[PDB]
Amino acid sequence: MTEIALIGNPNSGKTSLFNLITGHNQRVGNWPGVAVERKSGLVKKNKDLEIQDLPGIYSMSPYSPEEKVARDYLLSQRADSILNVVDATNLERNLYLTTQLIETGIPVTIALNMIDVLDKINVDKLSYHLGVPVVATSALKQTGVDQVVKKAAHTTTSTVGDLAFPIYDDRLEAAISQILEVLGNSVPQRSARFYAIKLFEQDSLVEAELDLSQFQRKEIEDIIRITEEIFTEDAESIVINERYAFIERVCQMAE
Ligand SMILES: Nc1nc2c(ncn2[C@@H]2O[C@H](COP(=O)(O)OP(N)(=O)O)[C@@H](O)[C@H]2O)c(=O)[nH]1
Structure with missing residues (x-):
């Protein structure tokens, strides 16, 4: 009933978060006519929510089969939410994709992952200026997972009206x-x-x-x-x- 697309840069901890969220409710196959893994799963703690994993990418260029899958799915309106996995240790470079993801018009929620390693980022001020919700998470310590899934489930194309784009x-x-x-x-x-x-x-x-x-x-x-x-x-x-x-x-x- 709510479809959340999980995407972010490679090695941001996306698999780790995906596995924690869905447990063993995962389906594996492929994207049609393309040699790219397609995986999805129901959220273990709330089976009305479904996570559609998307290939880890640095950007939405037209040259890569992974990036085109990422893009084609986000622009197809199947997703109610984008849960953007972001590497908090490398914040600025990860946000390159984040800006593109916001531009699709599917509301973004940021799992600010790897917060445990980072031990300076102001979460509330980061959320304010990006115009998207931001939840500090750790896939290692298993913190913020349920919180970010809950934020994303309530930050959808039908709950968000004023879509704030990067100006x-x-x-x-x-x-x-x-x-x-x-x-x-x-x-x-x-x-x-x-x-x-x-x-x-x-x-x-x-x-x-x-x-x-x-x-x-x-x-x-x-x-x-x-x-x-x-x-x-x-x-x-x-x-x-x-x-x-x-x-x-x-x-x-x-x-
Ligand atoms: N310290 C720390 N490590 C993490 C966190 N999330 C993922 N990792 C680690 O990062 C490495 C890659 O994780 P992974 O989920 O495969 O990243 P990806 N490629 O985006 O799926 C693994 O060793 C995993 O344990 C995190 O929040 N904190």
Whole structure:
């Protein structure tokens, strides 16, 4: 009845959390026509909640079969929640994916894992500035697991209304606004920002997927051409640097 997608960087403790949450209620198979493990399970302590594991990834690029599975599933609306496993010992770099996950429009909850090793992070202030709930967990000591599962189960597409996205530089936002206004009804409302950023990056999968008119296509090219002159960097590099700047600010404001 509530579908939670478990994802995060490799070696963030995702398997460990997944096994604790689901116990031996796990199903193993594969993603259709792709050589990638598919696993899921019911939450041991609440069988109305189901965890869909997703391959560990650093980013949602179009080049990797794992990343495409991650993306295709999150943009398919099967998930009510994303429970983002984050390595607290390497916070900033893990948040690179976190920003992308928020952009899908499926509400994110962060299991701030490996908190035991970390023994400075202000959980309440980190949650405030990222705009997602954050629960310190330890898969080793088995702390915060039930708490984060409970937060995620109550942080869904039907409970969350004001979806707070990472706001970037005015000059990138202008280009995203212009792309959203161009796209209009040609993409889903929930994940509109995800698609706009991807079109701005000239993402092969997204271009091939959307039936965009010549009118739409030409406006998006203009927007991209101009924004590259305003920033003096290529579209991809603009988005990469803006993601890290947003991560660098948020971490400054909360340690
Ligand atoms: N100290 C500590 N180790 C953890 C924690 N979570 C996972 N690990 C350890 O990290 C290593 C990799 O764990 P794993 O679940 O496979 O990470 P992944 N690859 O994201 O599934 C294992 O040795 C596991 O015991 C944690 O919260 N604290």
